[PDB]
């Protein structure tokens, strides 16, 4: 369960003595742990990528708790994400507000800042992740 060491909260499994790791459901809340410490970021759960957010981002969530986050972009540590109606980060080719993006399969982060090979073809992405016109 939850213990406080120095000042931060850690979670341990009832079968171990070292902190939990990976995606976990705890009393209707979602977390992604690293050596017991909830991680902030966009990580893969059982139904896609969730936003495990800084505390008090939505509905008084705690640090690392997954949140509702609908129909909007997120900038996180310089990486660009887009979240759909179901609060999951989109992947692959997407058209958003008339612009095309490609969200990478391993991370859900937008391809950005030049040429990428995707599906065997070379494409160009602006610094903002927007696919540029024409053939590359």
């Amino acid at each position, epitope marked *: 369960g939850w213990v406080t060491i120095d000042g931060r909260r850690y979670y341990f499994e009832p079968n171990t003595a070292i902190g939990a790791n990976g995606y976990k459901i705890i009393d209707n809340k979602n977390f992604y742990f690293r050596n017991g410490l909830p991680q902030i970021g966009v990580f893969k759960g059982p139904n896609g990528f969730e936003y495990f957010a800084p505390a008090n981002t939505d509905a008084n969530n705690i640090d690392g708790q997954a949140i509702r986050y609908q129909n909007r972009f997120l900038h996180l540590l310089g990486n660009i994400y887009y979240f759909g109606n179901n609060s999951k980060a989109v992947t692959g080719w997407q058209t958003i507000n008339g612009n095309m993006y490609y969200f990478m399969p391993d991370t859900a982060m937008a*391809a950005a*800042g*030049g*040429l*990428f*090979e995707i599906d*065997g*073809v*070379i494409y160009f992405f602006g610094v903002d992740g927007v696919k540029a016109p024409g053939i*590359y």
Partner: nanobody
Amino acid sequence: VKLEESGGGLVQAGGSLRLSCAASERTFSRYPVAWFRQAPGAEREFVAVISSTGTSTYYADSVKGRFTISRDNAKVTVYLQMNNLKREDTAVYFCAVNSQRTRLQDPNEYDYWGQGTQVTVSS
């Protein structure tokens, strides 16, 4: 993933030269491969890149129409065919593999490099 370059030397302006970049392993064929060129004391500037599939290419505006990048799956080799060569093309040429398929114009994104070979165009 070891890369061996060949084909370097000297040509007159307007002439042609073909460079080869041969890999030691079949995994090479799964990744995009680029050529960069470098003048003495200068930085490695982008020339051309080819997709893993061999059918998608991008050229520096400077060389579009004159240079062709291609690959031979059976030989695990990428080529740079240089036509209508100009003195401006004189440089050391490198081939390189970008296994992450990310930001293909940027040499810092490339994780394996050939040894580099001198091309000289005399006018």
